[PDB]
Amino acid sequence: ATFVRNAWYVAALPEELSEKPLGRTILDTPLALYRQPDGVVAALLDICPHRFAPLSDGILVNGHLQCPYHGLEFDGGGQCVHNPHGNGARPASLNVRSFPVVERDALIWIWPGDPALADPGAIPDFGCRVDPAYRTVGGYGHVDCNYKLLVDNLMDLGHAQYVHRANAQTDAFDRLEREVIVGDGEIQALMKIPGGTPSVLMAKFLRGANTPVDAWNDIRWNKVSAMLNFIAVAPEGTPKEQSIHSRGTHILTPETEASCHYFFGSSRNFGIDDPEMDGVLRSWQAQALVKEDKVVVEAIERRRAYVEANGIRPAMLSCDEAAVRVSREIEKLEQLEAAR
Amino acid sequence: ATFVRNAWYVAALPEELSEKPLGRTILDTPLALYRQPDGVVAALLDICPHRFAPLSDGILVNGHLQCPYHGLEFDGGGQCVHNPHGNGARPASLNVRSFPVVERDALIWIWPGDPALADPGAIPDFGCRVDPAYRTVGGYGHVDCNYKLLVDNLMDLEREVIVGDGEIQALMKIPGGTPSVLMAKFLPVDAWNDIRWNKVSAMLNFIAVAPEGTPKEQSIHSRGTHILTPETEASCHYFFGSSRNFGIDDPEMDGVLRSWQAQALVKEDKVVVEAIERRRAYVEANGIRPAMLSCDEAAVRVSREIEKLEQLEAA
Amino acid sequence: ATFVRNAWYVAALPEELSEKPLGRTILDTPLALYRQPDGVVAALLDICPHRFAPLSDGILVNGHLQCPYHGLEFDGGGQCVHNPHGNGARPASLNVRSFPVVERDALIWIWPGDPALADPGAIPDFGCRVDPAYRTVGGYGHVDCNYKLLVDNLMDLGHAQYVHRANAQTDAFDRLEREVIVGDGEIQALMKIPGGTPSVLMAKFPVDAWNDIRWNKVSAMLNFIAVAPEGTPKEQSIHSRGTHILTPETEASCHYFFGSSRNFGIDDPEMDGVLRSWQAQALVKEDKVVVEAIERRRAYVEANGIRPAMLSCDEAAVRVSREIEKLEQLEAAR
Ligand SMILES: COc1c(Cl)ccc(Cl)c1C(=O)O
Ligand SMILES: COc1c(Cl)ccc(Cl)c1C(=O)O
Ligand code: FES
Ligand code: FES
Ligand code: FES
Ligand SMILES: [Fe+3]
Ligand SMILES: [Fe+3]
């Protein structure tokens, strides 16, 4: 299974973690994730160095994670800080691997690769998630597809015209303007849908207003698989900076080669103290991101065996440029790492 | 997967198909099966050319199946007839594979193999199924075993096995016979229980009873549809039914003759063939072969011809 | 994948068997186990020689197991004794493999290997199990781990401190003392846990206590759990002799036969309760959880070339492990 290990991935949302460890597998690597008594999150390889028991089934003793099996204790650095057996000696072999963790932007980032290379400067900017001018809601979902399929999905936001048609269909779709801007290690796909009546969901954003709007659906990608979109609507022929908008957290982390973690969110500048608009956004997230898109990408994954065995290649359309560029960047990184 | 792909297989019963596509895999090939607005059945490879989404999760748009993902639209021939995107150009690369498909004898036949070789004249004769001299009912079942195990079971049970070109017939007459319970009341007798196999796995039996020494064609009888189609190497689809010339207007009789367990496979035999399939690993690893009994003649013949069709297909 | 096939394994408890066959796989070999009308247990390959049906889904007819599919009948030797078809001929090709079986000590022992080599003399001694001075109770558990992970567990019984916290905790356990004796194909870990107050379990039946365990190849263990007022001779204790016997099912799953044979309270049904309760919670639940968890981590450990780091409690389990691997590779030496 080929992953890009030397990169930061979101392993969890902060709300997911506590002093009770969470066992989760990223890049085929099982982790025990917990918040220590002092509040700082730790991430240990979920395999006790003694007999390979899951430490994530342990409990904290003295703020140290204790193996459930024979009770070796570890700090957040993976250092064995107590051995209860015999003379109680703790040689270097008893230490477990620890992973660099940065909690930032209401995300838990982890470096699954060479820890000497982990550079917090390199973590993607998701500042809107902690910016008090934005209201942020979201969650986690597990999907039985290769993460790359969900990168494809998200880098062609036009799929929403069909996959999400009940919420997202617009009658101005055939007037789409699409631009792609390639950075170094960053790619923006911009869409302007001009002059239409708002979609069901943009209508909700606007509290019903039925009259013609402009809508923008931009998405930004940073390596390996972390995306931030810009979903905006505004009376036709108004500035884009002045629009009500959602900045959408859409971050994938591989679990196995054929399964992945999906961390999604909306950070919105409108209806900031409105629980019902919270519910609208979490509704959308539940139906669109976690069912509708799940159904499509999970079915594509099930067809991978046929595609491969019959040497089938995709046929590309005008909507594909951003997703293909991103795909070729991920491949390029994969291949760099594969030596060695 | 070793299949005989160059043959007609039943993919569906016509009553399973509508303008809402059915997704079904035959011989490790996923199909989208639907009826166009003029009623004609289309069979497409269930994998969109763009990014491989399941067309069978799509709906029709003006008679054309629309991909649920980014909206490419296809005709029954697999031609892409609409591309919503950009200049809306439809190069040959956007066409999806379409499979030869014939609706005939109230069955949907598909040719999953080399399409140049697909000859609808070679489709097995199940004509009793649309003969109004017969009352026809049946249904569909799925089994987690290799299809050859159910062909075996089916070709089993004055005798007579007669053998030819992709057809084998197994005949049994039982004179001074015993009447079946269903045909009981519609009259000693002669019984008949015959079965005809055509390649690769399509069978039609003949369960019959008459007064002593009657034309077997004039008997009280049922012709039973028993057609298997491989799904994976270790699973199959089973299409079953009966075409009867008695109680043609009794619907209670329809009910039992529509029973999977009454007509196709009792829970207890299903348990056995699926259990045989779980034993396949062990037998293969230990080079264990089956030991045949006298009653195995027809099965073995049919087995040998299938194997012959397999061997021919390589290369 | 790699098993020691030339050895005796427990395939069932006697009370699991009857005229209704049981299908059970040992060392990747599916068996049909049943008790004939004369009381004698037979073990056949659970694959009809005709078309491979599960004979274990069949019934006895005149004491002969009848294939459910087309009704061949077999004796306990695997001879075909009836063919209801055509002229009823029974060619030798219709016989099924029958495995050597010995019912001893309230266990059913099967030899899955080279049948020429099956010496019932080499079956381990669990005589306490049919001793009138002992009351024996236990049962069967299935586990989704490689059996060797459960040998490990049983040979280092100083996890009960943490895995079994609730029943088997003692403050004495920093004052353990653990002696290991190795004989030919037999290893004993001894231990006397002196001076300490009793765990929940030992109170339920200033105390001294002792967990010894005997391993015999391949994976058959008998333990000794005793307890007695501080000062008392080990040999005059009240104690349980614990049957802990594993049989591989597949490379990543096994069969566990556990029991207690106790010399105390032996008419006493409450005591049956306590002992069956421990077995349910400790053995078939808590230990289950840990070893199945470790099995799931095998892929990563092997892919990454991780070897375990051993501790002071680990001698017995390590010596046993090394002997199993020895036998395993010896046999792969074709
Ligand atoms: C998938 O991206 C979105 C679209 Cl296309 C419309 C509205 C929203 Cl809230 C999102 C989102 O960020 O989840
Ligand atoms: C696992 O072995 C035991 C220990 Cl460590 C304590 C008490 C008992 Cl009853 C047993 C037993 O034989 O199950
Ligand atoms: S497995 Fe962790 S202490 Fe033994
Ligand atoms: S996958 Fe069918 S149109 Fe994109
Ligand atoms: S499979 Fe046992 S008699 Fe046919
Ligand atoms: Fe979507
Ligand atoms: Fe235990």
Cα gap C40→C60, rounded to integer Å = 13
- Pick the ligand that lies closest to the CA of residue C198: 2
Cα gap A183→A192, rounded to integer Å = 20
Which positions in chain B touch C46 (Cβ < 8 Å)?
A: 279
CA distance C11 to chain A (A): 28
Cα gap A224→A330, rounded to integer Å = 6
Q: Tell me whether A166 touches chain B (CB under 8 Å).
A: no
For B:276-315, CB contacts with C below 8 A are: 276, 279-280, 282-283, 288, 290-295
Which amino acid is present at B139? G
CB contact under 8 A, C294 and A51: yes
CB contact under 8 A, C313 and A46: no
Closest Cα to atom 1 of ligand 5: C51
CB contact under 8 A, C311 and A70: yes
At B217, list the tokens.
């064609």
Cα of B305 vs its chain's centroid, Å: 18
Nearest to A170 by CA among A207, A206, A201: A201
Distance C18 CA to ligand 2 centre (A): 29
Q: In chain C, what is the greatest distance between 2 CA atoms, to the nearest angstrom?
A: 78
CA distance A286 to chain B (A): 18
Interface chains of chain A (3 or more CB pairs under 8 Å): B, C
Say which of C161, C294, C313 has its CB closest to residue A53.
Answer: C294
Asked if residue C216 lies in contact with residue C100, where contact means CB atoms within 8 angstroms, the answer is: no
> B65, B69, B97: which to mutate for ligand 4, most atoms within 8 A of CB?
B69
Cα gap B288→C245, rounded to integer Å = 31
Q: Tell me whether C50 touches chain B (CB under 8 Å).
A: yes
Cα gap B13→B232, rounded to integer Å = 19
Cβ neighbours, 10 Å, residue C276: 14
Atom number in ligand 1 closest to CA A168: 6
Cα of B277 vs its chain's centroid, Å: 20
Closest Cα to atom 7 of ligand 1: A231
Closest Cα to atom 1 of ligand 3: A51
Distance B97 CA to ligand 6 centre (A): 27
Residue B16, SS3?
helix
Cα gap A30→A42, rounded to integer Å = 13
Cα gap C196→C206, rounded to integer Å = 6
Cα of C163 vs its chain's centroid, Å: 21
DSSP string across B163-225: E-SSEEEEEEEEES----TTTGGG--EEEEEEEEEETTTEEEEEEEEEETT--GGGSEEEEEE
Cα gap A267→A230, rounded to integer Å = 9
CB contact under 8 A, C152 and A51: yes
CB contact under 8 A, C83 and B291: no
Q: Please report which helix (H) or strand (E) contains residue B297, including its range.
A: helix B297-313
Cα gap C265→C235, rounded to integer Å = 17
Closest Cα to atom 3 of ligand 5: C70
Q: Name all domains of chain B by residue range, CATH numbers in brackets.
A: 1-130 (2.102.10.10), 131-315 (3.90.380.10)
Cα gap B76→B97, rounded to integer Å = 10
CB contact under 8 A, A70 and C297: no
**What residues contact residue C115 under an 8 Å CB cut-off, 6+ apart?**
C99, C100
Backbone region of residue C62 per phi and psi (left: phi > 0; alpha: psi in -120 to 50; beta: other values): left
Annotated binding residue at C64? no
CA distance C268 to chain B (A): 44
Interface chains of chain B (3 or more CB pairs under 8 Å): A, C
Residue C102, SS3?
strand
CA distance A106 to chain C (A): 30
**CB C240 near ligand 2, within 6 Å:** yes
Cα gap B7→B308, rounded to integer Å = 13
Distance B9 CA to ligand 4 centre (A): 28
CA distance A48 to chain C (A): 9
Cβ neighbours, 10 Å, residue A223: 18
Instruction: Find the Cα–Cα–Cα–Cα dihedral C281, C284, C290, C295, rounded to 10°.
Output: -170
Least CA distance to B274: which residue of chain C?
A: C53
Distance A231 CA to ligand 1 centre (A): 6
Annotated binding residue at B48? yes
CB contact under 8 A, C294 and A83: no
Distance A183 CA to ligand 6 centre (A): 24
**CB C225 near ligand 2, within 6 Å:** yes
Cα gap A65→A50, rounded to integer Å = 14
Cα gap C158→C175, rounded to integer Å = 12
- Of the CA atoms within 13 Å of residue C179, those in its CB half-sphere come to 7
Q: Tell me whether C116 touches chain A (CB under 8 Å).
A: no
Annotated binding residue at B226? yes
Cα gap B35→B18, rounded to integer Å = 5
Angle at A238 between CA A236 and CA A243, to 5 degrees: 100
Q: Classify burial at A313, counting beta carbons within 10 Å of its beta carbon; exposed 0-12, middle 13-18, buried 19 or more.
A: exposed
What does chain C come to in residues?
334
Residue C59, SS3?
strand
Nearest to C250 by CA among C99, C46, C29, C32: C29
Which positions in chain A touch B52 (Cβ < 8 Å)?
A: 300, 303-304, 307, 312, 314
Cα gap B265→B274, rounded to integer Å = 12
State how far the alpha carbon of C226 is from the alpha carbons of C173, C220, C262, in Å.
Answer: 16, 20, 10
Nearest to B153 by CA among B306, B309, B28, B265: B265
Task: Classify each residue of C251-265 as buried b or exposed e, where b means 16 or more C-beta atoms within 10 Å of its C-beta.
Answer: ebbbbbbbbbbbbee
Cα gap B235→C130, rounded to integer Å = 48
Nearest to C99 by CA among C87, C86, C108: C108
Residue A236, SS3?
coil
CB contact under 8 A, A159 and B69: yes
Cβ neighbours, 10 Å, residue A241: 8
- Of the CA atoms within 13 Å of residue B180, those in its CB half-sphere come to 16
Q: Establish, for the pair of chains A and B, how many residue pairs have beta carbons separated by less than 8 Å.
A: 67
At which residue do the structure tokens 């629309």 appear? Answer: B66
Nearest to B296 by CA among C65, C89, C64: C89
* Helix runs in chain C, H state only: 147-155, 165-168, 200-204, 269-278, 288-296, 298-304, 315-332
Phi/psi of residue C243, nearest 5 degrees: -80, 120
Cα gap A86→A52, rounded to integer Å = 20
> B64, B72, B83, B85: which to mutate for ligand 4, most atoms within 8 A of CB?
B72
Least CA distance to A83: which residue of chain C?
A: C311
Question: Looking at chain A, which runs of residues are DSSP E strands?
Answer: 9-12, 22-26, 29-35, 41-45, 59-61, 64-66, 73-74, 80-82, 101-104, 107-110, 135-143, 177-182, 186-194, 213-222, 226-235, 244-256, 259-268
At C229, list the tokens.
């007022």
Which experiment gave this structure?
X-ray
Annotated binding residue at A48? yes
Report whether the peptide linkage leading into residue C318 is cis, meaning its omega lies within 30 degrees of zero: no
**What residues contact residue B115 under an 8 Å CB cut-off, 6+ apart?**
B99, B100
Nearest to A158 by CA among B95, B67, B93, B55: B67
Cα gap C228→A112, rounded to integer Å = 53
**CB C260 near ligand 2, within 6 Å:** yes
